Amino acid sequence: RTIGIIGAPFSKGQPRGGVEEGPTVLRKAGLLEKLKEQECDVKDYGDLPFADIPNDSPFQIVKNPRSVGKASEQLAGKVAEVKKNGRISLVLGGDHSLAIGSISGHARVHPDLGVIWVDAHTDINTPLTTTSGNLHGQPVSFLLKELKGKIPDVPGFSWVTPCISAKDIVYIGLRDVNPGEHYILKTLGIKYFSMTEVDRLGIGKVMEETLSYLLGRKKRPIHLSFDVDGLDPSFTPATGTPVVGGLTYREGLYITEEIYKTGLLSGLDIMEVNPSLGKTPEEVTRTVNTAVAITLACFGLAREGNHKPIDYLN
Amino acid sequence: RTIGIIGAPFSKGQPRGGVEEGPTVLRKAGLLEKLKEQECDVKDYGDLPFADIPNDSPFQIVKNPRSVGKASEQLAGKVAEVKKNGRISLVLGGDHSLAIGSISGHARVHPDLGVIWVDAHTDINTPLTTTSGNLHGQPVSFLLKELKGKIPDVPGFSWVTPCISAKDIVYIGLRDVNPGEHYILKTLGIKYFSMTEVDRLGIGKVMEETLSYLLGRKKRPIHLSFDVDGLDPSFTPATGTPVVGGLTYREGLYITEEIYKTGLLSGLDIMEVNPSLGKTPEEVTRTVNTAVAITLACFGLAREGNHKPIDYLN
Amino acid sequence: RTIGIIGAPFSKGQPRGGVEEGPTVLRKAGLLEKLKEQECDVKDYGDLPFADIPNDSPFQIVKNPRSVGKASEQLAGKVAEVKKNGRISLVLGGDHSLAIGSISGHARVHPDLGVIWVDAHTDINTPLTTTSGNLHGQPVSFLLKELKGKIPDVPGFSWVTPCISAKDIVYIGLRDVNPGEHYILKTLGIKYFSMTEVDRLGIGKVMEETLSYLLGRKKRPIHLSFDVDGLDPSFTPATGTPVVGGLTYREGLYITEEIYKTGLLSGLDIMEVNPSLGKTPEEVTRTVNTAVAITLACFGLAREGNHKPIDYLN
Ligand SMILES: N[C@@H](CCCC[B-](O)(O)O)C(=O)O
Ligand SMILES: N[C@@H](CCCC[B-](O)(O)O)C(=O)O
Ligand SMILES: N[C@@H](CCCC[B-](O)(O)O)C(=O)O
Ligand SMILES: [Mn+2]
Ligand SMILES: [Mn+2]
Ligand SMILES: [Mn+2]
Ligand SMILES: [Mn+2]
Ligand SMILES: [Mn+2]
Ligand SMILES: [Mn+2]
């Protein structure tokens, strides 16, 4: 596949800053090198230089609003620039608030995209239902058209125009959903497969329904926003909000392998990797390695094996 | 749901005494507080004061018979008292021998109850087939009507009257069944889903069949006797008889979530939690936390989220 | 069942020598004693005394060819001798290169056998596609009739005559397949269930298809070549080539339990156990214990329980 790597070292969508070390540790793990080792065409668009906004007081309870709204504004333009180049944007990020810009810029070039959200959380809190005030747990609320008229005018986000409908998104891996968020889920009819549905149906069936749900009417570009805490912390411990009983390594790879096989993947997000939170150097390596594996699976690496179109027996 | 918490700090159903610290550590973990945080009506019936029986020599091979038969005699009356109050009895116990009193007192008020037994073992040894002599591995033998005429007159249990038929009980999670016990299983036609059936069908199907098996003829009150060693020791290490290859955290929560959803749960047992056996303080916290999670799932906590009947967008 | 234990302490099929300690640690774990504790008829054929071949330079890239071809030549005759005795050969080995002799000797007495290969790898590299030069990752290439005319004349293997067709073998657990190997897989139409198919179908379905695939036309003797790295390294860490995201303990036991139940098992291989690679003594015990469990499952030990044909209630 043909990639367009974008490093997004941002963390003001939440409290812990070590998250902006993601683009760095993932690249050192050899991500670019490994993609090239596959049938991949890769162009590194560099790490976006996010400028600090000293004067950025809370909007009510919402923290670092201008800083966050700016980082997504900047990211949105990069993602659109890479999608204009006929490449699949790979946003190596910090916190999940960057999804607002990622999905926004992608939808500018492909308004009919579908979103698959792998995460332990729904991240659909509005500035008024949030209790933490952290914008990384509110990205979907800014993107959903149906919630337009319920999101206040928060400093830094005037440029935002909801681009996805409640019916063009699927959640996979949920296990820590706030009360208001759940109300949103059932009220707007959002499709999701929490860990309970995964336990009941199996990831094989969960992926069949997910893909049918989004591509059954007609094929459309796929945006995969992957929060590494969607996977169990025994796989990705170095993340800010781990929740036990998560998706397995195998399930993580199954999800992505199936997405790749659709040939419809066009936008990907690898988020919330925070090395600074690894209890040990191995926990850091375990988290980074899992993130790389999931990434490579999105672009072709198959557990059954891969081979070029040639005669190996010669 | 409406609870009736009963602390049962008893351990003479087996060798290790640290098991009577269960009611204590579970309460300190905030169990009562967490239930109230949910749509739960809770009444703490206190910890039953089990009096020591100094003169209690073995009945043949059976150990602490009078002490065990008395603790279940006492528990049975409490469980019936709470069921008379129109509440779901939550027996926070020590060893599983207390199930004899738990199921007995529950059946006094609801003779038509069905039992779901989550455990690594069948606990169906009779005083004559047991090899350890520990009564916590014999509770079902005292309750099954079909085995009446095969259980000797053991000091301390004259008050017992078998209350459940071999066909009103389902086992989930089996992986360490004694030879005599297995003979009992196949001979009395007891329905069970060992770890092999779980591997074959998946916990989703296992729960569908379990619930159909017990409620298909007609709806009837459900008694869930949960031995924490039913789950793999990587989740509940602090328990006296761990067996590898157990139910996962997710499967544990799936089982209970499905039980709750039946609206038929009326009696629950959380057994065999022994803090004193945790290799480290974290193993203790891991065991206690898992037990609390399983408990909350029995009363409504859903992994997909929970919300009150109000308008959150306001 | 009736066993014929053969110890094969060989390791020249790969770099690390600690692998020849397998027959020793497995026996000390009480394997023979445990089999006898079951309805098993066991005869220990001893540990094959592999003589060192000082003069054994590489054949091109292939290492220790004469040493490896000799060890399998010797093993093949033992396996045939045990199969002549109407016993199920249990080859406790070193590295997987010994499979060439194991399957070869078994097929001499039962030409119509079927092979089930549990492994993280396909071990189907030819002397020309291999990149490591280690013969333990090439055993199947020597056995497949279809690849005859593609395997060079390697010193030590002239005695070999391919005995199995590409259609009489099934792979379970694959997750690290080389490019040439994959080309072989798809070209010869080899049936396999990588970790992706296991994730999709579940081990229950995977075993149903595996067994139907091999025994549907007609019942035929089963040869199970089990590489302990087929299971996840959280279960069998002490092995030379671990790959994350492997089969679970439960899945491992399910596979074997189902094989046993066919009553068709006639040859088994327990390979790649290397104690010297255990980070700690517990990792060694974890690996050894898992290997023993898998072995006992092949011969009857059932997780639901086992009982003799007698009346236990008496
Ligand atoms: N729901 C919590 C947790 C947020 C988790 C955000 B995430 O998924 O991006 O890590 C909050 O609203 O603050
Ligand atoms: N079957 C063994 C083990 C007993 C386990 C009892 B339990 O499940 O309550 O922990 C015995 O009869 O002693
Ligand atoms: N495919 C690699 C790894 C070999 C693994 C061999 B085995 O499965 O027997 O441990 C090689 O050809 O050298
Ligand atoms: Mn998120
Ligand atoms: Mn999250
Ligand atoms: Mn029990
Ligand atoms: Mn038990
Ligand atoms: Mn192998
Ligand atoms: Mn292998």
Coordinates of C-alpha atoms in Angstrom, one line a residue, chain C residues 3-312:
Chain C
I3 CA 2.7 -46.0 24.3
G4 CA 6.2 -46.5 23.1
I5 CA 8.4 -43.8 24.5
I6 CA 11.5 -42.9 22.6
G7 CA 13.9 -40.3 24.0
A8 CA 15.7 -38.3 21.2
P9 CA 18.3 -36.0 22.8
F10 CA 19.4 -34.2 19.6
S11 CA 20.0 -30.5 18.8
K12 CA 22.2 -30.1 15.7
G13 CA 19.1 -29.1 13.7
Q14 CA 19.7 -25.7 15.2
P15 CA 22.3 -23.6 17.1
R16 CA 21.4 -24.0 20.8
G17 CA 22.4 -27.3 22.4
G18 CA 20.2 -27.2 25.6
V19 CA 17.4 -28.8 23.5
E20 CA 18.8 -32.3 24.0
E21 CA 17.9 -31.9 27.7
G22 CA 14.3 -32.4 26.7
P23 CA 14.0 -36.2 27.2
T24 CA 15.7 -35.7 30.6
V25 CA 13.5 -32.9 32.1
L26 CA 10.3 -34.4 30.8
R27 CA 11.0 -37.7 32.4
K28 CA 12.0 -36.0 35.7
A29 CA 8.7 -34.2 35.6
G30 CA 7.1 -37.6 35.9
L31 CA 5.8 -38.2 32.4
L32 CA 6.1 -42.0 32.5
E33 CA 4.6 -42.1 35.9
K34 CA 1.7 -39.9 34.9
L35 CA 0.9 -41.9 31.8
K36 CA 0.8 -45.1 33.9
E37 CA -1.6 -43.3 36.3
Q38 CA -4.0 -43.3 33.3
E39 CA -5.3 -46.2 31.4
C40 CA -1.9 -46.3 29.6
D41 CA 0.4 -49.2 28.6
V42 CA 3.9 -47.8 28.5
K43 CA 7.2 -49.1 27.3
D44 CA 10.3 -46.9 27.5
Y45 CA 12.5 -47.6 24.5
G46 CA 15.2 -45.5 26.1
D47 CA 17.1 -42.4 24.9
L48 CA 18.7 -42.9 21.4
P49 CA 22.5 -42.7 21.7
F50 CA 23.3 -40.2 18.9
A51 CA 27.0 -40.5 18.0
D52 CA 29.0 -37.4 17.3
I53 CA 30.1 -36.8 13.7
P54 CA 33.3 -34.6 14.0
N55 CA 33.7 -34.2 10.3
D56 CA 30.5 -32.5 9.3
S57 CA 31.0 -29.2 7.3
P58 CA 28.1 -27.3 5.9
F59 CA 26.5 -28.3 2.6
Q60 CA 26.4 -24.9 1.1
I61 CA 24.4 -23.0 3.7
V62 CA 23.0 -26.2 5.5
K63 CA 24.6 -26.9 8.9
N64 CA 25.4 -30.2 10.5
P65 CA 23.8 -32.2 7.7
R66 CA 25.4 -35.6 8.3
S67 CA 24.7 -35.3 12.0
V68 CA 21.1 -34.5 11.4
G69 CA 20.5 -37.0 8.6
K70 CA 21.9 -39.7 10.8
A71 CA 19.9 -38.9 13.9
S72 CA 16.7 -39.1 11.8
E73 CA 17.9 -42.3 10.1
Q74 CA 18.4 -43.8 13.6
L75 CA 15.1 -42.4 14.9
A76 CA 13.1 -43.7 11.9
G77 CA 14.1 -47.3 12.7
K78 CA 13.1 -46.9 16.3
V79 CA 9.7 -45.4 15.5
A80 CA 9.1 -48.3 13.0
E81 CA 10.2 -50.8 15.6
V82 CA 7.7 -49.4 18.1
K83 CA 4.9 -49.2 15.5
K84 CA 5.6 -52.8 14.7
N85 CA 5.0 -53.5 18.4
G86 CA 1.5 -52.1 18.0
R87 CA 2.3 -49.0 20.1
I88 CA 1.9 -45.3 19.7
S89 CA 5.4 -43.8 19.3
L90 CA 6.1 -40.9 21.6
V91 CA 9.2 -39.1 20.5
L92 CA 10.5 -36.9 23.2
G93 CA 12.9 -34.8 21.2
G94 CA 15.4 -32.1 20.8
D95 CA 14.9 -29.9 17.7
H96 CA 12.2 -30.4 15.1
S97 CA 14.6 -31.8 12.5
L98 CA 14.0 -35.2 14.1
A99 CA 10.5 -35.1 12.5
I100 CA 12.1 -36.3 9.3
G101 CA 13.0 -39.6 11.0
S102 CA 9.8 -39.7 13.1
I103 CA 7.4 -39.3 10.2
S104 CA 9.6 -41.5 8.0
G105 CA 9.7 -44.5 10.3
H106 CA 6.0 -44.2 11.2
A107 CA 5.0 -44.1 7.5
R108 CA 7.1 -47.2 6.8
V109 CA 4.6 -49.2 8.9
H110 CA 1.6 -47.0 8.1
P111 CA 2.0 -45.5 4.6
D112 CA -1.5 -43.9 4.8
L113 CA -0.9 -41.7 7.8
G114 CA -2.1 -38.1 8.1
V115 CA 0.0 -35.3 9.7
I116 CA -1.1 -32.5 12.1
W117 CA 1.6 -29.9 12.6
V118 CA 1.2 -27.6 15.5
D119 CA 3.9 -24.9 15.2
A120 CA 4.5 -21.2 15.0
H121 CA 6.4 -22.0 11.8
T122 CA 5.9 -24.2 8.7
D123 CA 9.4 -25.7 8.8
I124 CA 9.1 -26.2 5.1
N125 CA 12.2 -24.4 3.9
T126 CA 14.3 -26.4 1.3
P127 CA 18.1 -26.4 1.4
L128 CA 17.8 -23.7 -1.2
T129 CA 15.1 -21.4 0.3
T130 CA 16.4 -21.6 3.9
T131 CA 18.2 -18.4 5.0
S132 CA 19.3 -19.6 8.5
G133 CA 20.6 -23.0 7.2
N134 CA 19.2 -24.7 10.3
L135 CA 17.6 -28.1 9.4
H136 CA 14.9 -27.8 12.1
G137 CA 13.2 -25.3 9.8
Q138 CA 13.3 -27.6 6.8
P139 CA 11.9 -31.0 7.9
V140 CA 8.7 -30.9 5.9
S141 CA 10.6 -30.2 2.7
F142 CA 12.3 -33.6 2.9
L143 CA 9.0 -35.5 3.5
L144 CA 6.7 -33.9 0.9
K145 CA 6.6 -36.0 -2.3
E146 CA 5.6 -32.9 -4.4
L147 CA 8.8 -31.2 -3.5
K148 CA 10.9 -34.2 -4.7
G149 CA 13.1 -32.8 -7.4
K150 CA 13.6 -29.6 -5.6
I151 CA 15.6 -30.9 -2.6
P152 CA 19.4 -31.2 -3.3
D153 CA 21.4 -34.3 -2.4
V154 CA 22.4 -33.3 1.1
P155 CA 25.1 -35.4 2.8
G156 CA 23.4 -37.6 5.4
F157 CA 19.9 -37.9 3.8
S158 CA 20.3 -40.3 0.9
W159 CA 18.2 -42.8 2.8
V160 CA 15.2 -40.4 2.6
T161 CA 12.3 -41.1 0.5
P162 CA 9.4 -38.6 0.7
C163 CA 6.5 -40.3 2.3
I164 CA 3.7 -37.7 2.6
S165 CA 1.7 -35.7 0.0
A166 CA 0.9 -32.0 0.4
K167 CA -2.7 -33.0 0.9
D168 CA -2.1 -35.4 3.9
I169 CA -0.9 -32.6 6.3
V170 CA -2.5 -29.8 8.2
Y171 CA -0.8 -26.8 9.9
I172 CA -2.2 -25.2 13.1
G173 CA -0.8 -22.1 14.8
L174 CA 1.3 -20.4 12.1
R175 CA 2.5 -16.9 12.7
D176 CA 6.1 -16.7 11.4
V177 CA 6.2 -18.0 7.8
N178 CA 9.1 -17.1 5.5
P179 CA 8.4 -15.8 1.9
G180 CA 9.5 -19.0 0.1
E181 CA 7.6 -21.1 2.6
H182 CA 4.4 -19.2 1.9
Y183 CA 4.9 -19.6 -1.8
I184 CA 5.2 -23.4 -1.2
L185 CA 2.0 -23.3 0.9
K186 CA -0.2 -21.7 -1.8
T187 CA 1.5 -23.5 -4.7
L188 CA 1.1 -27.1 -3.3
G189 CA -2.3 -26.3 -1.9
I190 CA -1.3 -27.1 1.7
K191 CA -4.1 -26.8 4.2
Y192 CA -3.4 -24.6 7.2
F193 CA -5.0 -22.7 10.0
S194 CA -2.7 -19.8 11.0
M195 CA -3.4 -17.8 14.1
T196 CA -5.6 -15.7 11.9
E197 CA -7.9 -18.6 11.0
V198 CA -7.9 -19.6 14.7
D199 CA -8.9 -16.0 15.6
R200 CA -11.7 -16.1 12.9
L201 CA -13.1 -19.6 13.5
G202 CA -12.2 -20.5 17.0
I203 CA -10.2 -23.6 17.9
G204 CA -13.4 -25.6 18.1
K205 CA -14.2 -25.1 14.4
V206 CA -10.5 -25.3 13.5
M207 CA -10.3 -28.8 14.9
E208 CA -13.5 -29.9 13.3
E209 CA -12.2 -28.9 9.8
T210 CA -8.8 -30.2 10.5
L211 CA -10.1 -33.7 11.4
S212 CA -12.7 -33.7 8.6
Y213 CA -10.0 -32.6 6.1
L214 CA -7.8 -35.6 7.0
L215 CA -10.3 -38.3 8.0
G216 CA -13.3 -37.5 5.8
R217 CA -12.4 -39.6 2.9
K218 CA -11.5 -42.5 5.1
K219 CA -10.0 -43.0 8.6
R220 CA -6.2 -43.2 8.6
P221 CA -3.5 -43.2 11.4
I222 CA -2.7 -39.7 12.8
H223 CA 0.8 -38.3 13.4
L224 CA 0.9 -35.2 15.6
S225 CA 4.2 -33.3 15.4
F226 CA 4.0 -30.7 18.2
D227 CA 6.5 -27.9 18.5
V228 CA 6.0 -26.3 21.9
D229 CA 6.5 -22.8 20.3
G230 CA 3.2 -23.4 18.6
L231 CA 1.9 -22.2 22.0
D232 CA 2.3 -18.6 23.2
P233 CA 5.6 -18.0 25.0
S234 CA 3.6 -17.1 28.1
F235 CA 3.1 -20.8 28.4
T236 CA 6.3 -22.3 26.9
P237 CA 9.0 -19.6 27.3
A238 CA 11.9 -22.1 27.3
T239 CA 12.1 -22.6 23.5
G240 CA 14.5 -21.4 20.9
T241 CA 12.2 -19.5 18.5
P242 CA 9.3 -17.9 20.4
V243 CA 6.8 -15.8 18.5
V244 CA 4.1 -13.7 20.4
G245 CA 0.4 -14.1 19.9
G246 CA 0.4 -17.9 20.0
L247 CA -2.1 -20.7 20.9
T248 CA -3.3 -20.6 24.5
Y249 CA -2.8 -23.3 27.1
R250 CA -6.5 -24.1 26.7
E251 CA -6.3 -24.2 22.9
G252 CA -3.3 -26.5 23.2
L253 CA -5.2 -28.9 25.4
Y254 CA -8.3 -28.7 23.2
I255 CA -6.3 -29.6 20.1
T256 CA -4.9 -32.8 21.8
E257 CA -8.0 -33.7 23.6
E258 CA -9.8 -33.8 20.3
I259 CA -7.0 -35.8 18.6
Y260 CA -7.1 -38.4 21.4
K261 CA -10.9 -38.7 21.0
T262 CA -10.4 -39.8 17.4
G263 CA -8.8 -43.0 18.6
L264 CA -6.6 -42.6 15.6
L265 CA -3.5 -41.1 17.2
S266 CA -0.5 -43.4 16.4
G267 CA 2.6 -41.1 16.4
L268 CA 3.4 -38.0 18.5
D269 CA 6.4 -35.6 18.7
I270 CA 7.0 -33.2 21.6
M271 CA 9.7 -30.9 20.3
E272 CA 11.8 -27.8 20.8
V273 CA 11.7 -27.7 24.7
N274 CA 15.0 -26.1 25.7
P275 CA 15.4 -25.7 29.5
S276 CA 18.6 -23.7 29.1
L277 CA 16.6 -20.8 27.6
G278 CA 14.3 -20.3 30.6
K279 CA 14.9 -16.8 32.0
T280 CA 14.2 -18.3 35.4
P281 CA 13.6 -21.8 37.0
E282 CA 9.9 -21.1 36.9
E283 CA 9.9 -20.4 33.2
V284 CA 11.5 -23.8 32.8
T285 CA 8.9 -25.4 35.1
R286 CA 6.1 -23.6 33.2
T287 CA 7.4 -24.9 29.8
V288 CA 8.0 -28.4 31.1
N289 CA 4.6 -28.6 32.8
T290 CA 2.8 -27.4 29.8
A291 CA 4.5 -30.0 27.6
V292 CA 3.6 -32.7 30.0
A293 CA -0.1 -31.6 30.1
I294 CA -0.3 -31.5 26.3
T295 CA 1.2 -35.0 26.3
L296 CA -1.2 -36.5 28.8
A297 CA -4.1 -35.0 26.9
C298 CA -3.0 -36.9 23.8
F299 CA -3.5 -40.1 25.8
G300 CA -6.8 -39.6 27.6
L301 CA -6.5 -37.0 30.4
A302 CA -9.7 -35.0 30.0
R303 CA -10.4 -31.7 31.7
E304 CA -14.0 -32.7 32.4
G305 CA -12.6 -35.6 34.4
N306 CA -11.8 -39.3 34.0
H307 CA -13.1 -42.5 35.7
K308 CA -12.7 -46.2 35.5
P309 CA -15.5 -48.5 34.3
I310 CA -16.7 -49.3 37.9
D311 CA -19.3 -48.1 40.3
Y312 CA -17.8 -45.3 42.5

